Amino acid sequence: DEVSALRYRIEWRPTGAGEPARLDGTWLVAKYAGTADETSTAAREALESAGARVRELVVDARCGRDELAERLRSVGEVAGVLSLLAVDEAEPEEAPLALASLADTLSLVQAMVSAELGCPLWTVTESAVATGPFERVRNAAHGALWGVGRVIALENPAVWGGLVDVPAGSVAELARHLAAVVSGGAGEDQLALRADGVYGRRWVRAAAPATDDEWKPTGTVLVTGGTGGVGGQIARWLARRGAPHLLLVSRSGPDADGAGELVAELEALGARTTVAACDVTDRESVRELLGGIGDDVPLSAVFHAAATLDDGTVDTLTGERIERASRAKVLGARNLHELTRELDLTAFVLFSSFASAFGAPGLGGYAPGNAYLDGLAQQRRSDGLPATAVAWGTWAFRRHGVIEMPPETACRALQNALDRAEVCPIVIDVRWDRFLLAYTAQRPTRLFDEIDDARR
């Protein structure tokens, strides 16, 4: 079936480094003052035991690229840089993407490019990813580093080493494989180190649900960005599925363009539709919105399509910039999560993107918000709550390998994902023979080592 050929998911498979062959030269360890000291010591011994001189690089939160550029031009020749900025980092209230490590990672990268160090950067994160459903993502925002990290790898390979996640508060794994990781020939740049081995991130095709389970829309279904392109198609799908009542929300709401014939089109399909103006970044507006739902038709599902798009390059991106532009997607999701955590929802669907699934040049500023969604969904599942972060491909990078999918087909793939209870399904139509060549044009990857069509 066409739908079953658009389904993919992320898995972590056991793998190896490829012989450490020791190191040489001087490595820098970037960290904040009085933070990640235990891990820094574990990293130092790991690197020094491999035959390298380690020096610390104490970074001041949100210092900027200019300051780091001057300091990197004084250290002299550098063999590599290990970033521990995301280690022992507290979650940022109010704005999750205001993470200092996100802003400073970008600053470090840009600075490394300016100082022309000519060496790769390796970023360590703590419990930022889950190798299995039994592991919990500690801070969903840390996922943004992996998201933007993937794009930086494609735009400036020479300066990007990779990403390594280790158990929060733990150092044993790091000081045990770090050496082999930074000096490996496997080409693994996306790894998770656990007490029971090393794992590598991999794309794999998803299986069909032989289960009788079939998600069905009941009561009221809320769709953010309902008046937008994607939210509109989702609404049409729900109506065709037999959804009783649809609540479409956006900042424009009833004033949105095309909203008029939108309701008429949905009501024609047999669904009572209501369009309301609501800014999902405003927690109070959302609370009032939810509170206005008829007791006769309780909210049962949420589809969060609200968002914005850009196209800036990594050298033009700043943590502040990213945080500000991804508010509807990120804050909208957080608010909806907090305000429905008590409701009896059957589905809570966040609209993620291929931008975070594998990332692409120019999408560096878009990847962060989508990665956060992936993490939030996994956190909800860990707490016994429903959630699905669907990484969407293009909806009908054309010749880049990704083929736009028909609205109808895309929604049936999602239906199938809800039926199998997949937390982070990837729904995209691509031609691997064309995609792979472009994705590894200047940088190889093992991300697609299990994709049949990637080996065929």
Write out the binding residues for NADP(+): 227-230, 250-253, 279-280, 329, 351-352
Identity of residue 311: D
Q: What does the alpha-carbon distance between residue 315 and residue 119 come to, in Å, rounded to a whole number?
A: 17
State which of residues 26, 41, 218, 281 lies at the interface with ligand NDP (CB under 6 A).
281
Min dist. Cβ of residue 108 to ligand NDP (A): 28
Min dist. Cβ of residue 256 to ligand NDP (A): 4
Q: What does the alpha-carbon distance between residue 116 and residue 118 come to, in Å, rounded to a whole number?
A: 5
Q: Is 392 in the site for ligand NDP (CB under 6 A)?
A: yes
| Discontinuities after residues in the chain (C–N over 2.5 A) | 396
Measured CA distances, 231 to 224, 237, 351 (Å): 7, 10, 10
Residues at the annotated binding site? 227-230, 250-253, 279-280, 329, 351-352
Q: What does the alpha-carbon distance between residue 189 and residue 313 come to, in Å, rounded to a whole number?
A: 21
Contact code string over 8-37 relative to ligand NDP, x by CB under 6 A: ------------------------------
Report the C-alpha dihedral over residues 413, 418, 423, 425, rounded to 10 degrees: 0
Q: Is 306 in the site for ligand NDP (CB under 6 A)?
A: yes
State which of residues 274, 353, 356, 388 lies at the interface with ligand NDP (CB under 6 A).
353
Q: Is 441 in the site for ligand NDP (CB under 6 A)?
A: no
Window 194-233: residues binding ligand NDP (CB under 6 A)? 224-225, 227-231
* Backbone dihedral region for residue 127 (phi beyond 0: left; psi -120 to 50: alpha; all else: beta): left
Min dist. Cβ of residue 178 to ligand NDP (A): 35
Q: Which is nearer to ligand NDP, 4 or 308 (CB)?
A: 308
Identity of residue 162: G
Q: Is 268 in the site for ligand NDP (CB under 6 A)?
A: no
Q: Which is nearer to ligand NDP, 224 or 445 (CB)?
A: 224
Q: What does the alpha-carbon distance between residue 225 and residue 217 come to, in Å, rounded to a whole number?
A: 18
Residue of 8, 32, 366, 372 marked active site:
366
Token digits of residue 42: 């574990």
Min dist. Cβ of residue 442 to ligand NDP (A): 25
Q: Is 251 in the site for ligand NDP (CB under 6 A)?
A: yes
Q: Is 181 in the site for ligand NDP (CB under 6 A)?
A: no
Q: Is 309 in the site for ligand NDP (CB under 6 A)?
A: yes
Among residues 407, 386, 9, 421, the alpha carbon closest in space to that of 214 is found at: 421
Q: DSSP string covering 214-244, please?
A: -----SEEEEETTTSHHHHHHHHHHHHHT-S
Residue nearest to ligand NDP as judged by C-beta position: 252
Identity of residue 6: L
**Residue 366 bears catalytic tag:** yes
Q: Is 335 in the site for ligand NDP (CB under 6 A)?
A: no
State which of residues 305, 336, 418, 427 lies at the interface with ligand NDP (CB under 6 A).
305
Min dist. Cβ of residue 72 to ligand NDP (A): 36
Q: Is 279 in the site for ligand NDP (CB under 6 A)?
A: yes
Q: Which is nearer to ligand NDP, 175 or 266 (CB)?
A: 266
Please write down the long-range contacts of 190-196, taking CB distance under 8 Å and 24 or more positions apart: 190/146, 190/150, 190/162, 190/163, 190/447, 191/15, 191/162, 191/163, 191/164, 191/165, 192/12, 192/129, 192/131, 192/164, 192/165, 192/166, 193/164, 193/165, 193/166, 193/167, 194/131, 194/167, 195/167, 195/170
Q: What does the alpha-carbon distance between residue 446 and residue 188 come to, in Å, rounded to a whole number?
A: 6
Segment interacting with ligand NDP, rule: CB under 6 A, options 114-122, 391-399, 416-424, 437-445: 391-399
Q: Is 105 in the site for ligand NDP (CB under 6 A)?
A: no
Q: Are 129 and 146 in contact (CB under 8 A)?
A: yes
Min dist. Cβ of residue 306 to ligand NDP (A): 4
State which of residues 103, 112, 223, 280 lies at the interface with ligand NDP (CB under 6 A).
280
Q: Is 406 in the site for ligand NDP (CB under 6 A)?
A: no
Phi and psi at residue 118, in whole multiples of 5°? 65, 25
State which of residues 170, 394, 415, 440 lies at the interface with ligand NDP (CB under 6 A).
394
Q: What does the alpha-carbon distance between residue 77 and residue 378 come to, in Å, rounded to a whole number?
A: 41
Return the active site residues.
Answer: 366
- Chain residues binding ligand NDP by CB under 6 A are 224-225, 227-231, 249-253, 256, 278-281, 305-307, 309, 328, 332, 351, 353, 392, 394-395
